[PDB]
Design an enzyme around this catalytic site. Structure first.
Site, PDB file in Angstrom:
ATOM      1  CD  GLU A   1      -0.885  -1.276  -1.559  1.00 12.91           C
ATOM      2  OE1 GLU A   1       0.243  -1.816  -1.469  1.00 12.91           O
ATOM      3  OE2 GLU A   1      -1.489  -1.185  -2.654  1.00 12.91           O
TER       4      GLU A   1
ATOM      5  CD  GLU B   1      -1.872   2.482  -4.545  1.00 19.50           C
ATOM      6  OE1 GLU B   1      -1.207   1.615  -5.165  1.00 19.50           O
ATOM      7  OE2 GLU B   1      -1.472   2.996  -3.479  1.00 19.50           O
TER       8      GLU B   1
END
Length: 316
Positions: free
Chosen positions: A134, A246
């Protein structure tokens, strides 16, 4: 016809504040029996979060042999259970609080990390390289550039392993085409070249109002499918492959339907999606944590494991 199905075994990335931190106190690695349990549920892929600070204590410095040993111990558990292991540098484009691209953390420092890490796993067919978890607060062009340098660095060492490349803006699948954060991930990542020709784009997707997973709520029973479409569309156009690194839903009827629509979506879009890893499992989640699929001490399945296993066994 999806290739990779599994879970994030979370633990090693916990308490990011404590450098280097103490093993078993501040962070943990998974037990071999966890790898075994998920393999029994039809899951062939484990994403393994770990900290850059723990594996390389000094920027551009040598690797920590102990932390590397713990990563290798996890790998032998995966190999025994015929599983793939994704090495996830769970660092949000930061090292000790400072962003990649600043004069504290240059782009070449990430390239150095992977230059050192890759040749340790260059033979192993079970090892997939997850460059960064991320990235955020760095522009898409600047991040793409740092990704490129890292890719070149890995391939220079002789490693042929699959590389998972994220975008900026928390690599959300929903915002892949958006220009709200500047030049889009879609436009910025077009330029990427891999001399090893073994690249896929890592996207993450949560289903609450702000797509973060801070609420145990899915906004509709179909929101998953809708938010992946921009990214899927992009992968098809560009002859590229994707990975859902995710994603999660809570235990409620609306969320259960949304999870089914999502897993069915990736199945029918398996021409561009390589697969998915659920967030999360690991022995260190609290009882009231809405996304855990870690089995109880008695060995019984969590509520969402029922749906997950169904789709996991459909792949391989």
């Amino acid at each position: 016809m999806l290739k990779y199905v599994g879970v994030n075994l979370s633990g090693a990335e916990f308490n990011s504040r404590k450098k280097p931190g103490t093993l078993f106190k501040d962070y943990t690695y998974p037990a071999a029996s966890d790898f075994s349990y998920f393999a029994g549920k039809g899951m062939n892929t484990i994403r393994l979060p770990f900290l850059w600070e723990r594996v390389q204590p000094e920027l551009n410095g040598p690797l920590d042999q102990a932390q590397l040993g713990l990563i290798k111990k996890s790998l032998e558990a995966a190999k025994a259970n015929k599983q793939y292991l994704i090495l996830d540098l769970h660092n949000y484009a930061t090292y000790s609080g400072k962003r990649i691209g600043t004069s504290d953390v240059p782009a070449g420092a990430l390239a150095d990390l992977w230059r050192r890490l890759a040749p340790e796993f260059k033979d192993d067919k079970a090892v997939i390289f997850g460059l960064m978890n991320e990235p955020n607060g760095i522009s898409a062009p600047d991040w793409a550039n740092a990704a490129q340098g890292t890719i070149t660095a890995i391939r220079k060492t002789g490693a042929k392993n699959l590389i998972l490349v994220p975008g900026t803006a928390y690599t959300g699948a929903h915002s892949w085409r958006s220009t709200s954060y500047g030049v889009s991930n879609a436009k910025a990542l077009e330029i990427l070249k891999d001399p090893g020709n073994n690249l896929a784009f890592e996207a993450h997707q949560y289903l609450d109002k702000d797509y973060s997973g801070t609420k145990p709520v899915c906004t509709s029973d179909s929101v998953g499918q809708e938010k992946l479409q921009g990214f899927t569309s992009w992968l098809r156009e560009n002859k590229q492959k994707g990975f859902l690194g995710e994603f999660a839903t809570a235990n409620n009827p609306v969320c259960d339907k949304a999870l089914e629509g999502m897993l069915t979506y990736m199945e029918k879009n398996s021409d561009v999606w390589l697969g998915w890893t659920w967030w999360a499992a690991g022995a260190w989640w609290k009882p009231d944590y809405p996304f855990t699929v870690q089995p109880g001490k008695d060995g019984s399945d969590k509520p969402q494991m029922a749906i997950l296993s169904k789709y996991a066994r459909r792949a391989g």
